[PDB]
Design a protein around this ligand. Structure first.
Ligand SMILES: CCCCCCCCCCCCCCCC(=O)O
Ligand SMILES: CCCCCCCCCCCCCCCC(=O)O
Lengths: 255, 268, 238, 57, 238, 268, 57, 125
């Protein structure tokens, strides 16, 4: 019949095709679903477009060099400046949505390497100096991929985030990051990684601007290698699609 | 109950359980039977000790403070927060979202301070413990009307008998005790950052009801937390790096693991 | 006026006790529960998840991403050794910081099987064969492939399927083993040996890397909860 | 109105429990809930993958 | 001779306890009960009664009957603001002394809707229109009518019916909110704006007043009883 | 149980719930549904904490007094009346007519007074608490026949164990404990005016049974009131102005509420 | 002669109570009487006024 | 019972109350309704919030003097810069909607005057 390496995904007016992809990982076994009436707390009527809000937004691409430590993204912040999802989460007070994460990095048969794509929920990050806490301009980058660091950040007073890679910034062993939904893109076999994260939070709805639930992290465990003659610029692309998005509390534009 | 292995015999088939694909993000569950012949051993072992309730249900000392019968500090004040003791904080940090009731035991121990006052006649000290929820009045002084406790809960304890103990329900405006909060207080994104945003659990005061004697007496109180009916969500990786502050997760970068001689050494 | 009699053990504060206690706040309306994904009901649901193992913890390699990579290159000979470590999940420096190890360092006893998942992270044209081996105690560690061949071994062929599982079984004299070091309950030795070679075509790198994950089988158990010797505080953090 | 339940004993005896306080948050800790479901963390993929099959056909 | 064992928590004096106690006066014939009108069975029967709000608490106005009056006059323009205050019933100076506020200052948590009843107290010939608005947080307070129009607003027309009700709903992220100030559970802002104007005929006053009452909806709840920070005593009164 | 909101959809009808008439003296009950579209949210919240019984059933300290083992004051006398502690008095003043049973706990704490007497040998102090109803005899002296208590109720307590506690029924010649009395004692309209007319609840005395030692010892007793099976009638507005005297409601005029910057300021 | 009643627990277990003293004024405080009737203070008018009607026709 | 001069209108999260109003005029006898499937031409899926898009937007007020000739408004343009209706009609290509028009001008018993409010379709000028 058919093979399992080929997949097609349609959402809104966007489509994603992959010919060498592994099995999709669906969160913790829960597919994202709308808020039921036996769980809500806001007595106002919600708004649910489900077409403009839910679609594959393609972010900016980053280059994978031989000495790249990794990158992290905040799902609420990255899409805040892209399309009606940005306009809606900006004009409302409460928002709720799940996310589909697709990472695309393609290489020929003569390249080697391995990436870890992990969706960490509630990723609080430690500051470089014990007294200070990280600032809003250093922790989250709107439609921008904040890179990590190979060596420890200086302990001099600053609001810089601790970007050391072997601690993931949250002060853990980078090895134990597997506990979260994760995918491996080895340039030997996989060319793409798909993840489906439901809405994981301790409240029914929360403000997107002052709370970023999920933090996508890409970590190159095994570095990229090649011999002279192969293309050296191998990029990495990340496409995020919201799912089952709804809002409450229509308020005057706020940025 | 732990599962039991099933007996297997020599095989020669195309299908291979050992070979899989770890890029999918799936843990390949392989019984010892797949990679070698095994005999039928029944397992009567149980996973009873592991359960989250049995792991977290052990009394642990969060904080201890001191107060003096006569002197500058006559009353003790403590903002009720976790993350001051490494042993319990590390255990709680295992799960991002936790939801538990609590049992509190107060071990109050007095001691005599060295002085020169003669003719001392020690009398049974009485200790009053008071809890002020966020918003209530504060006893600016050891003797103040606030200590009437017309609504606040309090406990009186005379020295010599069993320690006090009370049970506390799940006090949270949300649906679970959040352990990690990646956000700010202001929607401006400037202001308190981290878990200290969701810490408004109140304050706990303690004082001596009666002056024991003429000679100075110092008393120290220790507070014990006992989680009950606990529920945990979203498992997280263990700490690794020692804690530094009690208001955030700021840390100093540390090596993945202790080193050894080479890649083929069998000894640390 | 019921005449009673107190027994030894009264008016004490036992740590691991389970009694009833009057509530300080009566008639409290608890906030209702909601469905939050990923509910944990037993710690052995975390031990059954694959955890990256830092096999190459040599010197400075522990302070970079090079601790999780095992080097493998095209050699001029055959039968040499790739790596090896003792079966000490709660003690050895190799398994101490793994999720399985972090869980085991809280409980004194442990029993069950182990699953080592090896992933080859080389190019698409590089092929090879490896011999994974587990040798129970009784003798020292194996020093040559003719000696580790007699243990429990699984030849692995690098191909389309890039993942192989080594199921270290439960071969012991006691129902449980100690997480701390004890010669009475020695574990064994896990050694990997080059089977034939790692051959690559022209214009392809001849030095590749292998990664390893550790996980517990369906029959894992732990007992006797104890404090962990990893976390420590000089004073109350504030 | 007493509750009789079984004791946790070895392998290969009933005990009595009565609730006295009327707050439902004062009951003893429920220690016997030996239920598990490792399907959420291990094998969480969307498409079922049988053990002895080429994971990527 | 029943052997017992005392548990931790014995011989203590807990404040919010509920036990039995021997009576000092046995066999007392209590005076029988009689029917007295207006029996209270729940404090939320008092919170559902309208309470006059002192919106104009500016300077000396709190020491006279001018604190409860909101001034409204015939203007030369349109779209100006009449009044505004944050949704802080247990904290803001506007709702602190209202019955609802007095009840809320005893309990740490609160949840439910709010009902603001506005009554126009002008002449019989003066007509007008007002725009009441409730804007949830996320941005600052609205500064012009084009900004508060986008919130939850109810146009009010002054007519025979001299009373209008603004039902501030429950739009929040948490099931409960704190009565004390906390930015994590900010309430919102309630602002009233001139819709068109206040037009009067000849020989009639052009400066009228408006009054406001606050009350709770059928879905109000409170929790975690605490002491009130309003009443204090230096010594035992005698 | 708290009521739940009902879902509603856009309407265009002549009948208008929002517009009413507040001159009638009627509270217009308007669901959020009337002024805006709402979704069906079930409410599982409860009004359990609010009930009058749970609001007033918390131990509160009415009065505390002191007595000395040897000295001018060897016994303590207190007319049993409320309105001496602001925290409880304010709570009780909420309802004009109240009717409750009572639970009394006496926290007695001793202390040594500074002196020069040497060779002190402290002994377990015993405290006797006696209640004299209105009309009975009065112990003009610490040692007197009145302390036999052939009919009056009394409690003896040795220092070192749990505090005393007793339950008292509803003692009133009327059908309810009146909190406010707008009238005089004499029908002449000249004489005691106010609530002090209806305060004839008796007196409470306390003494040391045995002299503890040679050195002077001072003991202080605190009295706690716990209302049980409470019924309340005719709700009243809350105090606002601080109390001045314990025999009436005399006060000093105070501002309606704290002020702010202007009429459009969002901050205190 | 014991009395078995329900405990106050969360939403979305029986407890036992026995009276020992024979004065009927020594019983524990009855905390579960969640009954209300706000018709006395709110909407106390003599003539019924439906919600969506001109209060003064 | 009740009188016909009183009316209340609720839409989205907005409400309009009038105590001296005449009978509402409903277009040409047709209440606005969504596009049926036997009439559409765009094969793409449409987006319908129906809460943020549908609500009472209040425009700017103008003064009525003794020498005022009249005013005109364009319904698509006026709301183009106000709320999510403006954001949506800006991010899309095809739009479809009906409109509810309310005009408020109040005066005492001693004033006099008369206004004509007319919705002209396709008003080329
Ligand atoms: C005599 C005082 C009795 C009451 C004392 C109550 C103090 C504890 C209050 C609840 C704290 C629960 C834990 C909050 C911190 C956390 O969840 O991390
Ligand atoms: C050892 C003494 C035991 C008896 C002590 C009884 C003292 C209290 C008497 C009843 C007082 C009830 C409250 C009256 C004041 C009020 O209702 O406002």
């Amino acid at each position: 019949g058919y093979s399992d390496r080929v997949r097609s995904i349609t959402l809104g007016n966007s489509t994603i095709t992959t010919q060498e992809c592994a099995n999709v990982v669906v969160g913790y076994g829960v597919w994202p679903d709308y808020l039921k009436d036996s769980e809500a707390t806001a007595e106002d009527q919600p708004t649910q477009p489900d077409v403009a809000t839910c679609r594959f937004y393609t972010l900016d691409s980053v280059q994978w060099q031989k000495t790249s430590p990794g990158w992290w993204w905040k799902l609420p912040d990255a899409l805040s400046n892209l399309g009606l999802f940005g306009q809606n989460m900006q004009y409302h007070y409460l928002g709720r949505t799940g996310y589909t994460i697709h990472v695309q990095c393609n290489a020929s048969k003569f390249h080697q390497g391995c990436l870890l794509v992990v969706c960490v929920p509630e990723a609080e990050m430690g500051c470089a100096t014990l007294d200070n806490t990280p600032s809003s301009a250093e922790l989250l980058g709107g439609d921008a991929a904040k890179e990590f660091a190979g060596e420890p950040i200086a302990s001099g007073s600053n609001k810089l985030v601790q970007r050391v890679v072997y601690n993931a910034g949250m002060g853990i062993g980078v090895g134990n990051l597997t506990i979260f939904p994760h995918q491996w893109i080895n340039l030997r076999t996989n060319n793409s990684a798909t993840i489906v994260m439901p809405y994981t939070n301790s409240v029914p709805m929360d403000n997107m601007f002052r709370h970023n639930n999920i933090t996508l992290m890409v970590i190159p465990f095994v570095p990229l290698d090649y011999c002279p003659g192969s293309t050296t610029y191998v990029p990495i692309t990340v496409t995020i699609a919201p799912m089952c998005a709804e809002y409450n509390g229509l308020r005057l534009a706020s940025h | 109950r732990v599962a039991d292995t099933v007996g297997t015999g020599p095989t020669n088939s195309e299908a291979i359980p050992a070979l899989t694909a770890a890029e999918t993000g799936h843990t390949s569950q392989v019984v010892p039977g797949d990679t070698m012949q095994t005999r039928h051993v029944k397992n009567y072992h149980s996973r009873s000790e592991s359960t989250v309730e049995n792991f977290l249900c052990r009394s642990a000392c969060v904080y201890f403070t001191e107060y003096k019968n006569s002197g500058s500090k006559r009353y003790a004040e403590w903002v009720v927060t976790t993350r001051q003791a490494a042993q319990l904080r590390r255990k709680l940090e295992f799960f991002t979202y936790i939801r538990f009731d609590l049992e509190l035991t107060f071990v109050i121990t007095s001691t005599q301070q060295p002085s020169t006052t003669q003719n001392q006649d020690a009398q049974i000290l009485t200790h009053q413990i008071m809890y002020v929820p966020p918003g209530g009045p504060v006893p600016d002084k050891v003797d103040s009307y606030v200590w009437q406790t017309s609504t606040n809960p309090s406990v009186f304890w005379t020295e010599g008998n069993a320690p006090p103990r009370m049970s506390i329900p799940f006090l949270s405006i949300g649906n679970a005790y959040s352990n990690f909060y990646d956000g700010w207080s202001e929607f401006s994104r400037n202001g308190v950052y981290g878990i200290n945003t969701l810490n408004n659990m109140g304050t706990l005061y303690a004082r001596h009801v009666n002056t024991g004697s003429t000679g100075p007496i110092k008393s120290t109180i220790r507070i014990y937390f006992k989680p009950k009916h606990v529920k945990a969500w979203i498992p997280r990786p263990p700490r690794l790096c020692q804690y530094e502050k009690a208001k955030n997760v700021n840390f100093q970068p540390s090596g993945v693991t202790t080193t050894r001689q080479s890649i083929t050494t069998m000894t640390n | 006026g019921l005449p009673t009699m107190n027994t030894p053990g009264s008016c004490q504060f036992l740590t691991s006790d389970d009694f009833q206690s009057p509530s300080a706040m009566p008639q409290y309306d608890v906030t209702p529960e909601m469905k939050i994904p990923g509910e944990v009901k037993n710690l052995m649901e975390i031990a059954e998840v694959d955890s990256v193992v830092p096999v190459q913890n040599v010197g400075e390699k522990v302070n970079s991403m090079e601790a999780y990579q095992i080097p493998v290159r095209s050699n001029e000979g055959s039968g040499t050794q790739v790596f090896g470590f003792p079966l000490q999940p709660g003690y050895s420096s190799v398994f101490s910081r793994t999720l399985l190890g972090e869980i085991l360092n809280y409980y004194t006893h442990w029993s069950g099987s182990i699953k080592l998942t090896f992933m080859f992270c080389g190019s698409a044209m590089a092929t090879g064969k490896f011999l994974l081996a587990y040798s129970p105690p009784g003798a020292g560690a194996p020093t040559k492939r003719v000696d580790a061949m007699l243990g429990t071994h699984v030849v692995w062929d690098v191909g389309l399927q890039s993942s192989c599982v080594l199921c270290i079984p439960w071969i012991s004299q006691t129902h449980y083993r100690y997480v701390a070091s004890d010669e009475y309950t020695a574990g064994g030795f896990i050694t990997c040996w080059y089977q034939t070679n790692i051959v690559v075509p022209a214009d392809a790198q001849s030095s590749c890397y292998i990664m390893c994950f550790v996980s517990a089988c369906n029959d894992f158990s732990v007992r006797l909860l104890k404090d962990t010797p990893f976390i420590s505080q000089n004073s109350f953090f504030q | 109105g007493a509750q009789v339940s079984t004791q946790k004993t070895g392998a290969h005896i009933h005990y009595t429990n009565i609730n006295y306080y009327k707050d439902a948050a004062s009951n003893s800790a429920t220690r016997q809930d030996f239920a598990q479901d490792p399907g959420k963390f291990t094998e969480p993929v969307k498409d079922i993958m049988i053990k002895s099959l080429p994971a990527l056909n």
